[PDB]
Design a protein around this ligand. Sequence first.
Ligand code: MEL
Ligand code: CA
Length: 223
Amino acid sequence: IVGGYTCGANTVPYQVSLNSGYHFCGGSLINSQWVVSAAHCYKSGIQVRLGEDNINVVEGNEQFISASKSIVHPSYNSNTLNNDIMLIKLKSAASLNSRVASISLPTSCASAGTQCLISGWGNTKSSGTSYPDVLKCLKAPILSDSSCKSAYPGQITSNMFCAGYLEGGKDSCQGDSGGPVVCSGKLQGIVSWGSGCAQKNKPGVYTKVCNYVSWIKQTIASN
Ligand SMILES: N=C(N)c1ccc(CNC(=O)[C@@H]2CCN2C(=O)[C@H](NCC(=O)O)C2CCCCC2)cc1
Ligand SMILES: [Ca+2]
């Protein structure tokens, strides 16, 4: 997260860290046994870390659970990042409490102008490299489709939406991948892609979760 602020220990209870010996992507807990992340985060040998704040220090509220199975969206395209969504099932149910909670799926897609909260442990430099150990947060609005498409001609599909600031300075970045974009108490997006980080006229692109609610519900009910 570039140009954001420290969330504060466990203020974003649904945030998860995907770990393969180190943090490599974020994710969202949707219920006690399932995590939603981005397809481009796909990897074998994943441990899901819940109740995390400082990822390098055991503070006492963590739950480390291995993934039993991963399901990448059937139509995921690794070249364009269309349908960048993946589901991860935990080997055992996580204990839900104040510091570890699930986020609700959307009943509809949010409108442009809606303010959202994006969070992650990714890079904090627009031109450089500096990774934080505590969770970072950023409030950002969903941009109009025109602004989004003007920025990335011929690359935006109906399964994507832009969020952030066209002036730059504030944006998600590498390391935040798979993380949540919550607006009005619902999971509206997943940190997917962009051009560099926090660059002028290059806003962040996110997976539009509202289009996948049916797939999510049917898939988890059958696995
Ligand atoms: N909001 C942001 N600024 C932002 C947030 C998270 C990320 C991390 N995600 C990635 O790196 C994923 C896998 C490759 N892809 C990219 O972002 C690529 N650009 C890479 C680039 O131009 O930096 C995109 C460019 C557009 C065609 C698909 C590949 C990148 C940017
Ligand atoms: Ca910790």
